[PDB]
Structure formats: structure tokens, C-alpha cells
Design a protein around this ligand. Sequence first.
Ligand SMILES: C[C@@H](Oc1cc(-c2cnn(C3CCNCC3)c2)cnc1N)c1c(Cl)ccc(F)c1Cl
Length: 281
Amino acid sequence: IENLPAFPREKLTLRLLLGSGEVYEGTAVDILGVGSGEIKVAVKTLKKGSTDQEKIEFLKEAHLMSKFNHPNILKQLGVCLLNEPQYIILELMEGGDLLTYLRKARMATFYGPLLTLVDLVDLCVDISKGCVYLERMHFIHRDLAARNCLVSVKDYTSPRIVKIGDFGLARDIYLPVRWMAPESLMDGIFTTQSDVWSFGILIWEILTLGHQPYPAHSNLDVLNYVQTGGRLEPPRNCPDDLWNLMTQCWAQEPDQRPTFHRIQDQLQLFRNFFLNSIYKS
Ligand SMILES: C[C@@H](Oc1cc(-c2cnn(C3CCNCC3)c2)cnc1N)c1c(Cl)ccc(F)c1Cl
């Protein structure tokens, strides 16, 4: 019998509003144990006065993430459901969403990016470990994208971890046109193989520090371009092993796309290779 982690509302304390749906920073007395103390959390709230299909999506999400336990999957820590507004209590990720974290890194100083190739590869490895998990659990995400991942620290010096964070469109399988495989766009079909297509777009976002896919193309024009068999341009000075990986993720045919195990393999092998190459210089 599926139990959501009921958390005592009076033990929760909201504070800072983050954005819009409605996200607050806050603290929660003892979620992570008895001597847990007042740990910091994020809080997702469902409207007082929202659509009932919003409440249904709200609950379905809450239930979906109850299922997960993985380092690269955002923890849902508690819920406050017996009163409105309902609260979803999530571990706090102080870096905000991946996409913002990347763009700030790019734009801080033209001395250069605050994230190096090795930082960026570790991001890719992290998210890939999470997709391998989702697949092992027979879930398809259907909306992989940096805007949907979260970074654990705000700064660019401290050890960081990225997690897949928003599962509003995930489904059990046991616009955003720029991220969607061509099948998904023509036929409305989604699979774990279309998840690989969007992941390839994702690591392209990471390696360009949060650039817009197909900058040359309006939303309407995008499907035209992909139709052409056209694809993204390589990120500037992208390592050839990584470009090969992405390109393979966007094979026009779904069964020629690599698997997430393979994708994680590729990423760690490259990382190994690159690390070794520097140390024996
Ligand atoms: C639901 C919300 O949760 C969090 C948001 C944040 C956060 C911090 N900052 N910000 C925004 C502040 C305004 N500019 C954009 C980032 C969002 C941190 N931890 C969270 N658990 C969230 C957001 Cl807001 C975005 C993407 C996600 F995948 C998720 Cl899961």
C-alpha cells in the first residue's frame, strides 16, 4: 500500500519565495532523522483555487517520485496534503535549475566560464546515471532538459551534484519541440529511445553552457530542419568523442540510438581518457 511521506505542517516553516505552482525555500524540523534539526528544504505548493486536473497532476507527481531512490534523482522528503495549499517537500538544491546554473557560469567573466570541461563532463555523467536508474525502473521521462535538472550548490567552487528534478510528464512503461525526437513530433510516440534523443540535446546544453538549441530556427521551422536530417552544430571546441556520442543519440532511427548503459559507459571512458591525458603531459 503506497504511502506518501506525511510531514507535520507545523514542523514545516516557509520563508523565501523562489518562483512560479509556487516554490518556497524553507526549513523542516527533523525530516532527516530525530536529531535532524531544522534542515533546509524547497516547497512546491498546489494552488488554493486551481483546476482539479492540476490537483490530479499534483498528486500523480507526488506519487511518482515516492517511488525513486537514487543519488541523481531529486528527493521528495515530505508532503502536506490534508490541508490546502498542499505542500510537496523537496530537498533543497541551492544552485537552482541546471540551465540557469550553466548560463551564469558562462556569463560571469570573459576571463572565461566558471565551469571547465571536466566539471561539464561530471554533470553529464551524473544525469546519465539517473537515466539508467529511471530506465531500470521502467519509467520514461519525456522531458529531459537542463531546465528540469537541479544543482546542489550555488557556487562554482564547491563539490556539486546534479539531479533530474521535475517529473511532470514522466510515465511508467512497464514547446518543447527543440528537445523532442522526430517520432514524438510527428506521431506523438514516446519511448526510452526518445529519452536518449532528448538526453543528447541535454548534454549539448551542458557543453554549450545553456545555449538555445537550433538558434537559427523558429519553433515552426525546427521540425522542418530536423526533417531535413539537419541537427545541432557542435558546441565550440567540443571533444570529438563527445560529439560522436551526441550525434549517435540523435540517429533519425530509434534503434540505432545507444542505450543509457552505453551512454554512461561512453562518458566515464572519455572522462578516464581525458584525465589520463592531462596527467601524462
Ligand atoms: C520544484 C522546484 O524545486 C526546487 C527549486 C530550487 C530553486 C532555487 N532557485 N530557483 C530559481 C530561482 C529563480 N531563477 C530560477 C531558479 C529554483 C531549488 N531546489 C528545488 N528542489 C524546481 C524548479 Cl523551480 C525548477 C526545476 C526543477 F526540476 C524543480 Cl524540481
